[PDB]
Amino acid sequence: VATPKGSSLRTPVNLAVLKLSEAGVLDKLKNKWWYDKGECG
Amino acid sequence: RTVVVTTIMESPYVMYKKNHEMFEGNDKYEGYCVDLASEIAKHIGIKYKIAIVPDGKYGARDADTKIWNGMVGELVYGKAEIAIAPLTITLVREEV
Amino acid sequence: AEDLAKQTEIAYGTLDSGSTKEFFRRSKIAVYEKMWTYMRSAEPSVFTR
Protein backbone atom coordinates (compact mmCIF):
# COMPACT_ATOMS: atom_id res chain seq x y z
CA VAL A 1 0.00 0.00 0.00
CA ALA A 2 1.62 3.25 -1.11
CA THR A 3 1.44 6.78 0.25
CA PRO A 4 3.12 10.02 -0.72
CA LYS A 5 6.56 10.36 0.75
CA GLY A 6 6.42 11.29 4.39
CA SER A 7 2.61 11.03 4.67
CA SER A 8 1.43 10.64 8.23
CA LEU A 9 -0.84 7.73 7.11
CA ARG A 10 1.99 5.34 6.40
CA THR A 11 2.64 4.10 9.94
CA PRO A 12 -0.95 3.17 10.69
CA VAL A 13 -1.41 1.54 7.29
CA ASN A 14 1.66 -0.55 7.82
CA LEU A 15 0.52 -1.79 11.21
CA ALA A 16 -2.91 -2.55 9.71
CA VAL A 17 -1.29 -4.69 7.01
CA LEU A 18 0.64 -6.60 9.65
CA LYS A 19 -2.47 -7.12 11.82
CA LEU A 20 -4.50 -8.33 8.84
CA SER A 21 -1.68 -10.64 7.80
CA GLU A 22 -1.38 -12.13 11.27
CA ALA A 23 -5.13 -12.58 11.72
CA GLY A 24 -5.25 -14.61 8.53
CA VAL A 25 -7.47 -12.07 6.76
CA LEU A 26 -5.18 -11.49 3.76
CA ASP A 27 -5.12 -15.26 3.14
CA LYS A 28 -8.93 -15.38 3.46
CA LEU A 29 -9.25 -12.57 0.92
CA LYS A 30 -6.90 -14.19 -1.57
CA ASN A 31 -8.82 -17.45 -1.38
CA LYS A 32 -12.10 -15.57 -1.76
CA TRP A 33 -11.11 -13.77 -4.95
CA TRP A 34 -8.89 -16.42 -6.61
CA TYR A 35 -10.07 -19.85 -5.71
CA ASP A 36 -13.51 -19.86 -4.10
CA LYS A 37 -14.77 -18.16 -7.23
CA GLY A 38 -12.68 -20.15 -9.76
CA GLU A 39 -14.49 -21.26 -12.96
CA CYS A 40 -12.27 -24.13 -14.07
CA GLY A 41 -13.24 -26.81 -11.55
CA ARG B 1 -11.12 14.65 5.37
CA THR B 2 -12.12 11.88 2.97
CA VAL B 3 -9.02 10.02 1.87
CA VAL B 4 -8.65 9.76 -1.92
CA VAL B 5 -7.60 6.21 -2.81
CA THR B 6 -6.11 5.65 -6.22
CA THR B 7 -6.52 2.14 -7.61
CA ILE B 8 -6.71 0.36 -10.98
CA MET B 9 -9.35 -1.72 -12.80
CA GLU B 10 -7.48 -5.05 -12.69
CA SER B 11 -9.32 -8.27 -11.96
CA PRO B 12 -9.86 -9.59 -9.30
CA TYR B 13 -8.38 -6.63 -7.38
CA VAL B 14 -10.94 -4.08 -8.54
CA MET B 15 -13.85 -4.93 -10.84
CA TYR B 16 -17.07 -3.24 -11.87
CA LYS B 17 -19.96 -4.70 -9.90
CA LYS B 18 -23.08 -6.01 -11.54
CA ASN B 19 -25.47 -3.05 -11.73
CA HIS B 20 -22.64 -0.54 -11.48
CA GLU B 21 -24.49 1.58 -14.07
CA MET B 22 -26.99 2.61 -11.39
CA PHE B 23 -24.59 2.63 -8.39
CA GLU B 24 -22.41 5.48 -7.13
CA GLY B 25 -19.19 5.91 -5.30
CA ASN B 26 -17.39 2.97 -3.75
CA ASP B 27 -20.45 0.75 -4.29
CA LYS B 28 -19.61 0.58 -8.01
CA TYR B 29 -16.64 -1.70 -7.36
CA GLU B 30 -15.81 -5.07 -5.89
CA GLY B 31 -12.72 -7.23 -5.46
CA TYR B 32 -9.71 -8.02 -3.33
CA CYS B 33 -8.49 -4.41 -3.08
CA VAL B 34 -12.00 -3.10 -2.48
CA ASP B 35 -12.23 -5.43 0.51
CA LEU B 36 -8.69 -4.57 1.58
CA ALA B 37 -9.40 -0.82 1.40
CA SER B 38 -12.41 -1.30 3.67
CA GLU B 39 -10.31 -3.24 6.20
CA ILE B 40 -7.44 -0.79 6.16
CA ALA B 41 -9.82 2.18 6.50
CA LYS B 42 -11.56 0.49 9.45
CA HIS B 43 -8.31 -0.19 11.27
CA ILE B 44 -6.90 3.24 10.56
CA GLY B 45 -10.12 5.16 11.19
CA ILE B 46 -10.58 7.05 7.96
CA LYS B 47 -13.33 7.55 5.40
CA TYR B 48 -12.34 7.16 1.76
CA LYS B 49 -13.24 7.41 -1.90
CA ILE B 50 -12.00 4.94 -4.44
CA ALA B 51 -10.89 6.57 -7.66
CA ILE B 52 -9.67 4.65 -10.70
CA VAL B 53 -6.38 5.99 -11.98
CA PRO B 54 -7.06 8.28 -14.91
CA ASP B 55 -4.48 6.88 -17.32
CA GLY B 56 -5.05 3.23 -16.38
CA LYS B 57 -1.36 2.72 -15.58
CA TYR B 58 0.61 1.38 -12.63
CA GLY B 59 3.40 3.90 -12.87
CA ALA B 60 6.64 4.61 -14.63
CA ARG B 61 8.91 7.60 -15.01
CA ASP B 62 9.50 9.02 -18.48
CA ALA B 63 13.28 8.84 -19.03
CA ASP B 64 13.18 12.10 -21.01
CA THR B 65 10.77 14.33 -19.04
CA LYS B 66 11.23 12.52 -15.71
CA ILE B 67 7.46 12.74 -15.13
CA TRP B 68 5.71 9.87 -13.34
CA ASN B 69 2.51 8.42 -14.72
CA GLY B 70 -0.08 5.99 -13.34
CA MET B 71 -0.92 5.51 -9.69
CA VAL B 72 2.64 6.43 -8.73
CA GLY B 73 2.17 9.77 -10.47
CA GLU B 74 -1.17 10.33 -8.67
CA LEU B 75 0.69 10.08 -5.36
CA VAL B 76 3.78 12.03 -6.46
CA TYR B 77 1.77 15.02 -7.75
CA GLY B 78 -0.70 15.05 -4.88
CA LYS B 79 -3.82 13.84 -6.71
CA ALA B 80 -4.38 10.90 -4.35
CA GLU B 81 -3.61 10.26 -0.66
CA ILE B 82 -3.00 6.50 -0.87
CA ALA B 83 -2.83 3.72 -3.48
CA ILE B 84 -4.53 0.41 -2.63
CA ALA B 85 -3.80 -1.77 -5.63
CA PRO B 86 -1.51 -4.57 -6.88
CA LEU B 87 1.35 -2.06 -6.89
CA THR B 88 4.78 -3.71 -6.80
CA ILE B 89 7.34 -2.44 -4.29
CA THR B 90 10.40 -1.39 -6.30
CA LEU B 91 13.58 0.58 -5.79
CA VAL B 92 12.74 3.42 -8.14
CA ARG B 93 9.29 3.82 -6.60
CA GLU B 94 10.62 3.69 -3.03
CA GLU B 95 12.78 6.70 -3.92
CA VAL B 96 9.67 8.82 -4.55
CA ALA C 1 -11.00 -40.59 -3.88
CA GLU C 2 -7.74 -39.88 -5.67
CA ASP C 3 -9.06 -41.81 -8.69
CA LEU C 4 -12.22 -39.69 -8.69
CA ALA C 5 -10.26 -36.44 -8.39
CA LYS C 6 -8.05 -37.19 -11.41
CA GLN C 7 -10.78 -37.78 -13.99
CA THR C 8 -13.96 -36.11 -15.27
CA GLU C 9 -15.96 -38.82 -17.06
CA ILE C 10 -17.52 -40.06 -13.82
CA ALA C 11 -19.39 -37.39 -11.90
CA TYR C 12 -19.69 -37.49 -8.14
CA GLY C 13 -21.38 -35.64 -5.33
CA THR C 14 -22.75 -35.62 -1.78
CA LEU C 15 -25.90 -35.09 0.23
CA ASP C 16 -27.02 -31.49 0.82
CA SER C 17 -27.21 -29.94 4.31
CA GLY C 18 -25.05 -32.49 6.07
CA SER C 19 -21.60 -33.21 7.39
CA THR C 20 -20.22 -34.84 4.23
CA LYS C 21 -20.77 -31.74 2.12
CA GLU C 22 -19.24 -29.60 4.86
CA PHE C 23 -16.23 -31.95 5.00
CA PHE C 24 -15.42 -31.27 1.37
CA ARG C 25 -16.18 -27.56 1.59
CA ARG C 26 -13.73 -27.13 4.47
CA SER C 27 -10.97 -29.60 3.58
CA LYS C 28 -7.45 -28.26 3.11
CA ILE C 29 -6.31 -31.73 1.93
CA ALA C 30 -5.36 -31.40 -1.77
CA VAL C 31 -7.35 -34.38 -3.08
CA TYR C 32 -10.51 -33.38 -1.21
CA GLU C 33 -10.08 -29.68 -2.07
CA LYS C 34 -9.80 -30.69 -5.74
CA MET C 35 -12.95 -32.79 -5.39
CA TRP C 36 -14.82 -29.90 -3.74
CA THR C 37 -13.69 -27.44 -6.40
CA TYR C 38 -15.18 -29.76 -9.03
CA MET C 39 -18.38 -30.62 -7.13
CA ARG C 40 -19.32 -27.09 -6.18
CA SER C 41 -19.36 -25.93 -9.81
CA ALA C 42 -20.49 -29.11 -11.60
CA GLU C 43 -23.55 -28.82 -13.88
CA PRO C 44 -26.04 -30.29 -13.57
CA SER C 45 -25.80 -30.37 -9.78
CA VAL C 46 -24.05 -33.37 -8.29
CA PHE C 47 -25.69 -32.83 -4.92
CA THR C 48 -28.77 -34.69 -3.80
CA ARG C 49 -31.50 -33.89 -1.28
UniProtKB/Swiss-Prot annotation, chain B:
User: Which post-translational modifications are recorded for this protein?
Assistant: Palmitoylated. Depalmitoylated upon L-glutamate stimulation.
Subcellular location, in the record's words? Cell membrane; Postsynaptic cell membrane; Cell projection, Dendrite
Tissue-wise expression: Detected in cerebellum.
Q: Which family does it belong to?
A: Belongs to the glutamate-gated ion channel (TC 1.A.10.1) family. GRIA4 subfamily.
Complex formation: Homotetramer or heterotetramer of pore-forming glutamate receptor subunits. Tetramers may be formed by the dimerization of dimers. Interacts with EPB41L1 via its C-terminus. Isoform 3 interacts with PICK1. Found in a complex with GRIA1, GRIA2, GRIA3, CNIH2, CNIH3, CACNG2, CACNG3, CACNG4, CACNG5, CACNG7 and CACNG8. Interacts with CACNG5 and PRKCG. Found in a complex with GRIA1, GRIA2, GRIA3, DLG4, CACNG8 and CNIH2.
According to its UniProt entry, what is the function of this protein? Ionotropic glutamate receptor that functions as a ligand-gated cation channel, gated by L-glutamate and glutamatergic agonists such as alpha-amino-3-hydroxy-5-methyl-4-isoxazolepropionic acid (AMPA), quisqualic acid, and kainic acid. L-glutamate acts as an excitatory neurotransmitter at many synapses in the central nervous system and plays an important role in fast excitatory synaptic transmission.
Q: What is this protein called?
A: Glutamate receptor 4
Source organism per UniProt: Rattus norvegicus
